[model samples]
Target: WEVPRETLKLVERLGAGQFGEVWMGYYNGHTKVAVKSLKQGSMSPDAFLAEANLMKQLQHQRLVRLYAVVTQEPIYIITEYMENGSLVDFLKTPSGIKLTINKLLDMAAQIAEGMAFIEERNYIHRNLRAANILVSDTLSCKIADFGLARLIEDNEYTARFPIKWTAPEAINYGTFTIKSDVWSFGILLTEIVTHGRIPYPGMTNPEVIQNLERGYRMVRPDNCPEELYQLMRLCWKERPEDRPTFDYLRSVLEDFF
Candidate 1:
């Protein structure tokens, strides 16, 4: 099913991840976009269809917009390209570094705002982490990777490995609710404060879970604000019901600013 190639021009390789490789491409004449070609046979047909449908319906400024879907021989997903790349990449540079408490809080607040927007739409971002949070040249944060996301009404539980960003309940029970996403948001907050340090570094997934079950908390960076530390702790609580909603989290962070 070779279709006309005039619709897009591949500019360069952007990055690769569990889903597929992303490319920086030009669409139409002046619009720049990121094209993701799903790996052949990578996901079941149902999963792929679900993700595509989810992308088509969900719209928010802080979430990446899926512009088009090419159903030719090789499927392609077109999305807006963020010139600044991911939060992890931006944190590496000295000038782009977020070392101060205020800067970290600002970044976290932006992420929380985006999460709140998505949650209000009744979508759960199952895979939230530093790498999934993209930043624009304007320093606005947008959440990407809806491949693992699920609709609230679907009541589906796809078992995946322990995403360190997820909360204890999600890790053990394979339940991904809005509250579970709050747990991941807390981990995202920690990653922002720690400048993208891997959570529970050096420990295997099982080891990390054991430590968490035994009441070991993630280490807060030295420069992290005390209020932020408490927020993180509250988010990582064992009981999902105890975690704050995205709206509540947004208010807490906004209070600091």
Candidate 2:
């Protein structure tokens, strides 16, 4: 995946985070691509390489494609260009208002297929939320942003991770596993139904954590179907093993649509 820096010409800055900014750039003046240029010393070389390796491993259409890496002064990880940006923003537009339940459910199933791939490979997407899901011009949703990913039992970013979208056990012990990821997927489902509204809206992190300790969960979104809400509940089961696997989830969601 080695790429010569001369081929990439940065065009417009698309987004940024603590690590670096992603740009809508051109490859050899003809092809459009998303180029994530890592800031100098943002992280160790080994850590960056690890994320790139995982990006390479996942090659599903429902997952963002990683094309090449420019490992020069400003390291860059080039990937497939997604036109509509994050799914959250995409759902906020007029198109989202017109989307039928079946359409949203289809999007959810596509994401489930992507996550099932990761789960089958024994990987956990520590940051599974609406903000990390990107959409193409044709409204195709795919999971992206692996800068905060880790394997099962890893806890490198517990302090900084969003507690609202996390599982009960993950917050209590700083543990992340496939089940924990499933819990976040439930929260993501909330986002989908509510048209990208913040999960646990208006609740502070501390209050959410405290209530979570006592088995409290969010109420169903306005006009949300009972069946879909029930599936979200299934993902929040206290026991990790009790949570349904991604394969099972995809099957149920497929049936729903």
Candidate 3:
């Protein structure tokens, strides 16, 4: 989809990051949307375009909707405007704390369900975490930012690691299979259950990875049920083949709910 650049009424600046800045905008005075603009020359045009292609290819209820792209300078990309914003921010709010455990579990299940859709096509969500999950006004959760992490080199865009979320094999060998995404999903489950607490809290990135390399996994969250933690560990297996698929993760999480 395409829209005229000036046709977008940029109402408010939503956010800015290494990848780009997002503005709350309206299209032709009809649609309220989130307009993201990638920084000029941040990544190879073909590479950036490939990421855009991934976004355009995905269409799922639990995935953020990429409505259109205004292909000009700065590369404006439009998506559905999620009123509640990032799940990390939502989980941090006092109001977010009031949400029942069932609600949080439902959110987790929704993310896995959406990711299961991607897994069918053999794509991996290299980055999956609370920060990458957006909440709609109705409290519905949607996975956002698919495959944008690979476009940047070291310490460049956001400089985030899959450290806490990453699979052991991927970390050591740079492998990004669906199993790696599943591993990240497990860490994401911890994040949701703990209301956005940092995974492997108090450990630096290097420390966390080093420990994982030595087979020291994180213990269950104080409030998390044993079944959920068990599922999380299933995703963190030493061998990628031993890890549960998104389909399996969703089934188990649904069973928990």
Candidate 4:
């Protein structure tokens, strides 16, 4: 719901990423919220707010909830506050690394379940990655940064896309679809198994792209189950159509529990 701009109390700045500056804030004096202020010149204000309007209709437990948007200078996008922050940052902690494999699989299941809903809605989450998935105080994972808003940004396309997580077809043809997301999900699975380790460790972006085009894929990480590794392999299929659907992936991950 749209609220008066003054009603928002900007508490402090949160860690800003490629998206823009995120501020910890309070709505209506008591309600905690995360305010994402889009960077200037990122995209048209009308287009940006339109996407936010679309996202407001997508409400799911595993999807990060978009509460309201203030259409003014630097555009403030308010969303539900997640206590734990990004999953990637959390996984780097000692406690994160110490999590049992079952816990990791549980987290994976939640992500897949959330993605399955997106896929069902025919919505593409082009920015699917460990870094984009936010973690809650209870250690639950929620999907974020989906929708066509960011995809339409011109500057991000020039060099911002993460080569490691993006699908080969997407990289080669500038096409992004659910299949592309499946490919990214494979990379995300690796991130989870490796406790937030970067994909193709020690390799530069160019080298990783070269290796990918050469038909080379990452080997299983330490402690990853064979079944999980095989699933990752399925998602990394060269043909976009060959990639398993999020529905199938969610089913497989759920059964692991």
RMSD of each: 4.9, 3.7, 2.3, 3.0
Per-residue lDDT, model 1, residue 109, is 83
- Rank by lDDT (best first): 4, 2, 3, 1
Say which candidate scores most in lDDT.
4
What TM-score fits each model? Answer: 0.87, 0.91, 0.92, 0.91
Tens digits of per-residue lDDT for model 3 on 74-146? 7887888999888987898998888888889989989999989989877778888788888999999988877
Q: Per-residue CA lDDT of candidate 1, range 155-251, in tens? A: 1211115457767776677778888888888888867876777678788878887887897887776767788889998998788889888888888
Name every residue pair that clashes in candidate 4. Answer: none
lDDT score at residue 43, model 3, on the 0-100 scale: 58
Kindly report which residue stretches of model 4 are placed more than 4 angstroms away from their true locations once superposed.
17-19, 149-161
lDDT value, residue 132 of candidate 2: 82
lDDT-superior candidate, 2 or 3: 2
Which pairs clash in model 2? none
lDDT of 2 by residue, 74-155 (tens): 8888877888887877788888767888989989998999999988887778888887889988878889754355522112
Query: Model 4, range 8-108, lDDT digits (tens) per residue?
Result: 99888875545467789999889999987877786677765765775686779998887888887878888878887889878989889899999999999
